Amino acid sequence: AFELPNLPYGFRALEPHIDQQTMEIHHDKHHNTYVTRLNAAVEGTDLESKSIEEIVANLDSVPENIQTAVRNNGGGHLNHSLFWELLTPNSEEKGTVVDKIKEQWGSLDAFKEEFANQAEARFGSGWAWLVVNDGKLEIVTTPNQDNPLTEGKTPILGLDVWEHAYYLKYQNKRPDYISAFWNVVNWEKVDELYNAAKHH
Template sequence: MAFELPKLPYAYDALEPHIDAKTMEIHHTKHHNAYTTNLNNAIAGTDLEGKTIENILLNLDLTNAAVRNNGGGFYNHNLFWTILSPKGGGEPTGELEEAIDKSFGSFEEFKAKFVKAATTQFGSGWAWLTVQKGGKLEVVGTPNQDNPLMPEIGGEGTPILGLDVWEHAYYLNYQNRRPDYIESFFNLVNWEEVARRFAIEK
């Protein structure tokens, strides 16, 4: 069965003023939609057809650029939309809070590390919070549409939080002010969803 562009769990203007409606609409209907279409085209008639996106990425042949780029783009954006919320922000609680304190020392230290990964990612890419079996958390940056599920990319965990730092994610509103966009992102993080993913993957 072909992959489908997921519907957003909120309206395009729901994340304003942090992410504007025009950016959201273009990002979802143009960029994410293109990754979805191109991924389906890349796997049509191959042994990858019918597999989950996680299975495809975990066993990816990194030389297969079409699947690497579009499969990554499809998965990354699927996660990105779900960890954003108009009612987001604040800090995590419960087991996730404890794991962040154990892995980084405090929420503030985690945030500083995540902000640095996102800010210093040269060109296009992503910043991630990943969890390994056993509950250890790690901050990882990846270029382009790569992510930590892919072999030999960096990090050994499953992403539970991701931030898109491609210019198409923020340029209409923030232009070259990537740090301002990154700071605004934390006003939108749906920590309940991140905690749900943590509980499944730890």
């Protein structure tokens, strides 16, 4: 019952910051595999009528024998679903969260530096996040497909630092990928996620 969402732009739309080949394989193979395996895990359980956000927020209540499959593949589905919507060929560094970041870090650039440092320091596979914890902004990273929702922090920006997300264009140069990412951040979607969670 979970479905692979179409990208909200073309595979080529994020060039030259993220290559078309990566956008295609990352979406049509990696994300698709998470959807297939999530559906196999939840099929015939009462997870199958729940939102992915409810499942990932409540992984501790997922039946023991499927909890790892749901953590990994449910996490994969939520994280990539967020990621596609958080990218745009028309990125503008403005809006409510940019203003909150400038207030807290003193500048957007100082925030980008801390986010880049944490994203680079995430050893192995995982994600770098800006989260809202009970109205407050924090940078965190997670391993594999873990999502801050599970820890009661609402993600409003995420960067995939699995090597599949950057290896074809950047190989070992994760810092260059992180630098490229700023050019395609959908700050409108960041604002939408923040606004939804500041009053929830």
